[PDB]
Design an enzyme around this catalytic site. Sequence first.
Site, PDB file in Angstrom:
ATOM      1  CD  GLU A   1     -52.140  73.550   0.805  1.00 34.10           C
ATOM      2  OE1 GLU A   1     -52.905  73.044  -0.045  1.00 34.10           O
ATOM      3  OE2 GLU A   1     -51.741  72.941   1.814  1.00 34.10           O
ATOM      4  CD  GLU A   2     -48.455  74.779  -1.212  1.00 32.90           C
ATOM      5  OE1 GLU A   2     -49.257  73.861  -0.934  1.00 32.90           O
ATOM      6  OE2 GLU A   2     -47.382  74.950  -0.595  1.00 32.90           O
TER       7      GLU A   2
ATOM      8  CG  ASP B   1     -49.448  70.538   4.269  1.00 30.65           C
ATOM      9  OD1 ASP B   1     -49.542  69.948   5.364  1.00 30.65           O
ATOM     10  OD2 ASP B   1     -50.441  70.798   3.567  1.00 30.65           O
TER      11      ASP B   1
ATOM     12  CG  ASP C   1     -55.571  72.709  -2.142  1.00 28.72           C
ATOM     13  OD1 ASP C   1     -56.176  71.722  -1.680  1.00 28.72           O
ATOM     14  OD2 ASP C   1     -54.332  72.771  -2.225  1.00 28.72           O
TER      15      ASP C   1
ATOM     16  CD  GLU D   1     -57.366  71.646   2.089  1.00 30.61           C
ATOM     17  OE1 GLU D   1     -56.360  71.072   1.627  1.00 30.61           O
ATOM     18  OE2 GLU D   1     -57.616  71.672   3.308  1.00 30.61           O
TER      19      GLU D   1
ATOM     20  CG  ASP E   1     -47.560  71.016  -3.527  1.00 30.84           C
ATOM     21  OD1 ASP E   1     -46.770  70.400  -2.786  1.00 30.84           O
ATOM     22  OD2 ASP E   1     -48.756  70.677  -3.676  1.00 30.84           O
TER      23      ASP E   1
ATOM     24  CG  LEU F   1     -51.332  69.096  -6.680  1.00 24.83           C
ATOM     25  CD1 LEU F   1     -51.837  69.207  -8.113  1.00 24.83           C
ATOM     26  CD2 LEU F   1     -49.895  68.620  -6.674  1.00 24.83           C
ATOM     27  CG  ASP F   2     -57.228  68.390  -2.194  1.00 22.49           C
ATOM     28  OD1 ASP F   2     -57.029  68.797  -1.030  1.00 22.49           O
ATOM     29  OD2 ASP F   2     -57.947  67.396  -2.467  1.00 22.49           O
TER      30      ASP F   2
HETATM   31  O1  LIG Z   1     -53.897  61.419   5.563  1.00 19.10           O
HETATM   32  P1  LIG Z   1     -55.098  62.139   6.159  1.00 19.10           P
HETATM   33  O2  LIG Z   1     -54.819  62.691   7.545  1.00 19.10           O
HETATM   34  O3  LIG Z   1     -56.365  61.307   6.112  1.00 19.10           O
HETATM   35  O4  LIG Z   1     -55.377  63.459   5.240  1.00 19.10           O
HETATM   36  C1  LIG Z   1     -56.076  63.336   3.990  1.00 19.10           C
HETATM   37  C2  LIG Z   1     -56.417  64.720   3.502  1.00 19.10           C
HETATM   38  O5  LIG Z   1     -55.198  65.463   3.270  1.00 19.10           O
HETATM   39  C3  LIG Z   1     -55.403  66.392   2.218  1.00 19.10           C
HETATM   40  O6  LIG Z   1     -54.384  66.174   1.267  1.00 19.10           O
HETATM   41  C4  LIG Z   1     -55.282  67.799   2.781  1.00 19.10           C
HETATM   42  O7  LIG Z   1     -53.943  68.087   3.150  1.00 19.10           O
HETATM   43  C5  LIG Z   1     -56.773  66.097   1.596  1.00 19.10           C
HETATM   44  O8  LIG Z   1     -56.715  66.133   0.183  1.00 19.10           O
HETATM   45  C6  LIG Z   1     -57.111  64.717   2.150  1.00 19.10           C
HETATM   46  O9  LIG Z   1     -58.516  64.595   2.310  1.00 19.10           O
HETATM   47 ZN   LIG Z   2     -52.549  71.738  -1.850  1.00 18.96          ZN
HETATM   48 ZN   LIG Z   3     -55.832  70.383  -0.340  1.00 17.82          ZN
HETATM   49 ZN   LIG Z   4     -50.519  70.966   1.342  1.00 21.12          ZN
END
Ligand SMILES: O=P(O)(O)OC[C@H]1O[C@](O)(CO)[C@@H](O)[C@@H]1O
Ligand SMILES: [Zn+2]
Ligand SMILES: [Zn+2]
Ligand SMILES: [Zn+2]
EC number: 3.1.3.11
Lengths: 328, 328, 328, 328
Positions: free
Chosen positions: C90-91, C61, C111, C273, C67, C113-114
Amino acid sequence: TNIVTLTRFVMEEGRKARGTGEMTQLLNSLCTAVKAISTAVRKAGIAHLWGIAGSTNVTGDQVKKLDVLSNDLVINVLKSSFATCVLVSEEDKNAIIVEPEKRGKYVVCFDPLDGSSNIDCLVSIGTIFGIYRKNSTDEPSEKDALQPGRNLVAAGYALYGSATMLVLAMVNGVNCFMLDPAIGEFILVDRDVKIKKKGSIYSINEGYAKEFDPAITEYIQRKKFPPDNSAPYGARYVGSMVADVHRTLVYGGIFMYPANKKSPKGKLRLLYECNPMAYVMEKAGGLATTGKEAVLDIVPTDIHQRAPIILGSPEDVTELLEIYQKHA
Amino acid sequence: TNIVTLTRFVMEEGRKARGTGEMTQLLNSLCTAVKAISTAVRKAGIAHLWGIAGSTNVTGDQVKKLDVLSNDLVINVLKSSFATCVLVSEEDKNAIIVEPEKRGKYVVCFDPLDGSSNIDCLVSIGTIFGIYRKNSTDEPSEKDALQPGRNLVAAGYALYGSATMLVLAMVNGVNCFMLDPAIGEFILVDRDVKIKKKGSIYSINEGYAKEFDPAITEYIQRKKFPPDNSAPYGARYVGSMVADVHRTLVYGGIFMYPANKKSPKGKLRLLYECNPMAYVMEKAGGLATTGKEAVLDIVPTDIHQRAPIILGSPEDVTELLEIYQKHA
Amino acid sequence: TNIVTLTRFVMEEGRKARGTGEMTQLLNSLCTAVKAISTAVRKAGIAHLWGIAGSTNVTGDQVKKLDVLSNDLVINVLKSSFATCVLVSEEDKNAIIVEPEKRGKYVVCFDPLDGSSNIDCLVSIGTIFGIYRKNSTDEPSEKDALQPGRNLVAAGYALYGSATMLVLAMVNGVNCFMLDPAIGEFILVDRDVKIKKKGSIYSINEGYAKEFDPAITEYIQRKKFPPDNSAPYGARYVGSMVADVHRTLVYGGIFMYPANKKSPKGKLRLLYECNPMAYVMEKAGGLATTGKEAVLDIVPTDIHQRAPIILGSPEDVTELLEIYQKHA
Amino acid sequence: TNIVTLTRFVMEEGRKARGTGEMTQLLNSLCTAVKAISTAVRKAGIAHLWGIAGSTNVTGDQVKKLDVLSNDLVINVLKSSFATCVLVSEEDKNAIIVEPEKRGKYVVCFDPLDGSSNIDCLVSIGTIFGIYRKNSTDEPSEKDALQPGRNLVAAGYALYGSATMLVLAMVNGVNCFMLDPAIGEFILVDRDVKIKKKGSIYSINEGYAKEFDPAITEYIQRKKFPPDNSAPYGARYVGSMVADVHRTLVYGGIFMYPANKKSPKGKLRLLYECNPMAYVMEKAGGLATTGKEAVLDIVPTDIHQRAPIILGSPEDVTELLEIYQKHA
Ligand SMILES: O=P(O)(O)OC[C@H]1O[C@](O)(CO)[C@@H](O)[C@@H]1O
Ligand SMILES: [Zn+2]
Ligand SMILES: [Zn+2]
Ligand SMILES: [Zn+2]
Ligand SMILES: O=P(O)(O)OC[C@H]1O[C@](O)(CO)[C@@H](O)[C@@H]1O
Ligand SMILES: O=P(O)(O)OC[C@H]1O[C@](O)(CO)[C@@H](O)[C@@H]1O
Ligand SMILES: O=P(O)(O)OC[C@H]1O[C@](O)(CO)[C@@H](O)[C@@H]1O
Ligand SMILES: [Zn+2]
Ligand SMILES: [Zn+2]
Ligand SMILES: [Zn+2]
Ligand SMILES: [Zn+2]
Ligand SMILES: [Zn+2]
Ligand SMILES: [Zn+2]
Ligand SMILES: [Zn+2]
Ligand SMILES: [Zn+2]
Ligand SMILES: [Zn+2]
């Protein structure tokens, strides 16, 4: 759901007159600056805004950090309001003339931050302002700020106390608005304020007893030892003109910062401290004097001019004047 | 990004001792109540919290609306902390005994809202508390609140000024934390505070000159007219014990609320007003006396007991004691 | 006046067990970090927190600015809680081992920041965490973070949506707390949450139709074209796992991020996650699967391990499993 | 210290024109309402604002509690702005005519609260508005709200996401302002926004596949299975027109809510939902169509009229139009 903001309130009044409306702009921009100062003050210790700025103003005051931030905030917002032409700040040596492109018909005198001694001990502090309408067509200059307080079209102060308040006085009266931290709007809380005819509180720094004049001295003794065997006035002196005055307004009583043997013209500055408060005080049925003349009738000769000031409840202020008269 | 909250700070200290940790809980729950009061006060005019509650406390005070809200807030949070057993409030006739299920080993005395006279004029107000550890195994009762201030394990006050501050004093010292409005956390701002040896400020209500005793009278004259031809002390009296005391702490000087001819035991309440401040003052290298004995050494006989109180800078407080001695 | 904070709530539960209480500390410190992130996010554009941090995590990522800030905030607060020993973010490339002096018995995976893709368009984002109790006496190490989700003692997430919410799931259930911006306290708003038996919403990124497997493909067609002539499910896909999952929880339905032909183990990370959400989902009467096994029963082999994840309403998740079964 | 508020920004532009300035008033009063809604939403669960209001609007929607509060807030503030004469809200059966005393030359159409389905799950929601200048002298009436979007002088929306944003589009362009929670001021954060020529995101509710028309169906397949062997577009559908559109604006791509076999005119309302967004979209170099005509060129016949709407990046929207053309 029907918020009575200062903005709705002011237009509500100025509606009848039907002016250019640059006053509502003026006050709006003043409110923005007032909210940022309030927010900065609310976190000055954590923000590292305590200390000195490393400089001295014309009045000889030791410039603080919050003086600078607040001075800038106010100066910038007033310039961007497209409603002011000449600006006078306690923190600026000379009058700030507004560049042509953003000029307005208003002259504003202000004390960016009042109560310098109380910043580090979290005691109430504020912002005082006076607004004059340029009474000429000559090219804007400092001369436009040298008007007597009687010429104010509006004035007031921001009070950063346990709650942030904006007191606004205009031709028809005084009104207090409280800053709702939630939405950042000054809500009306005290409509058409009127100070009472006589209070039971006197405020002044009694550390200057040795330098006090015969009149001040007698009035104080009279406050502690009533001739008619009545209860003595209580005493209160916060140390920030804005806080004590405001308390005078809503509680009644008297506030004093007279001249002594060391200062013929007292200490507070006429342009941005006395006149505003004198205006507010009068629009609320109160009085504001030097001991021998109405503060609002003084014609300035210097933008950083000082003047003694005794204000508050009619009967209290008159009693002191009667004494000054007996001693003259 | 490395926030130094009061919580991190307290654990940081109590870590060594390795106790049950119910103190950190106690203070945490106290901080929650302190934030809601601060928020309520910040909008009291807009929220319609100004006015009276329609009742009189044992001390004869006219209960205000913010006394009730703040009293409830604090009482509930302390009960839910599972860290207190006996509670004493200025607003409650008798000691509040905590139901068994939520009992803790701590006894807390508090002034829900200090500075009653300054609520409506936005002048600084606050919350004062003292925390004693139940020194027995007997069934919890009011007797557990009748300990001398020297027995305090912690004490302090919340100050709702131009910024909300929490001053906390414990066995090893005093520290000031400022409430960050953004995240609602008291951040450390003044570490290991020490009041100076001698100030240049005296605070007391001089409206009581006629009732003052010979000692108080002389000390004041001495403050206005120095015997050694030195500059006279400046004067400051906000009107809220919390505000003036706190200013004494960080600026040095002296605060006084002695007894007069009308009140043998002064006015401030020993349990929730004097002892806390006396504790704070001593932990900062200062002194707190009645004029003839250390406030912390007084063994209470009534939870709503009053006591004269002279506190602040060592040398200033000593000078006054020397005078009380000469007059005795 | 009787605030039901998350803190009062948690102690209220853990009271019976009578543990060391470092969990209440853990969550308290987690709440502090959650409030600062929420506050930073609320002003990211004005604060200049948008953009990239200039780095790539193990998952490949593109590290964002929020983040880092959020990662630091959380890492520091967890270390200062004196309740954690091993931390997985995750970081961070490897497990962060807590220095002896501040060690606790808890292992936290998070995580910071999700919803990375939704930061710049103000779409809901959040923080996900899982808390394991060190199940050994061996010297703390990354191995302690490689436990199956079934071993979680608590887990949840902070949701920075139109309102900031903290959803907390423990052995006995799920509860939602909402951050009161006024006093910075998470107030209980949804007690003992239970997802419904069957929803009418399916969420998944359909941009991956070409890479979807036979099972996913059929389930979707089935959602759009019901075999029983019933109304088709509505569709919703915010793009931040935290936002869609949370909506699944309170609205019922199904959320999917299965594996395709490009990714055998899907995309979301197991440790910080999937397991948290799987735990939350199960404690609410819901289901969380990979398509061929319960997410919580997976024994990790890598702290940055990925895993397909299908979760939500029992009957919806079962219907999909039945299809995966028919296709196997 | 030199805050660039929306107010300073707007005057900064309208300065040249030198109008009555009631627009700056209009937007100011709109900002006040937008801040209270944002604040109410930020605590809807704790404030008990979740649920239904117990009523149905003309569009048949089940009126929510935040619809009412936000509707009132906006209606009152617009009336008090002394700048509007005719008001159209999705929540009001007929056009609200402003009483003579407070009339202005502006006609405002608004969606008090957009994203009804996402209020309870904390998903982004907002406020959409369009401002027309009364193009007549006839007595103010609903007819004044039945103008084509091309007649808008300004329009935009408030977005209550992880941060509150106000996007404002006028004749010369689009600008995004972010609400600083600290001082309650919308600060400029994205100047002269321009959507990219082509995105890689498509948003639409695919739960309506059975009711989709041949064109929509083909475009979607084309998005999932590119004819040129290019990467398929990602998918995103928050569920609140305001949130998805805004993401389209800053990320590029396409948003669709076409008509099906059940709805000839789609679902979104022309007056307060489509035109505003269509205006915003065009002022940013984007396109907004129904599939067979420019949304802004539609002359309304009913203030609660619906219209299909396909908007976003030029090339994406054109590609879909080309398909609608092939199918016609
Ligand atoms: O753009 P995509 O492939 O649907 O990914 C979305 C997913 O990515 C994430 O940010 C995880 O990296 C989740 O929060 C989200 O559900
Ligand atoms: Zn994150
Ligand atoms: Zn996430
Ligand atoms: Zn990430
Ligand atoms: O310390 P002193 O001399 O009483 O001065 C107090 C006055 O100083 C001021 O800060 C003006 O400089 C006022 O706010 C206040 O009333
Ligand atoms: O008006 P007085 O008699 O000076 O009393 C002031 C004192 O009253 C108190 O409110 C106590 O009741 C203190 O906060 C303050 O120091
Ligand atoms: O659930 P559906 O049919 O996709 O409708 C979603 C649309 O509904 C709306 O709330 C309009 O009513 C929009 O904000 C959103 O785009
Ligand atoms: Zn000064
Ligand atoms: Zn000043
Ligand atoms: Zn001043
Ligand atoms: Zn009292
Ligand atoms: Zn009290
Ligand atoms: Zn008190
Ligand atoms: Zn609706
Ligand atoms: Zn709506
Ligand atoms: Zn809508």
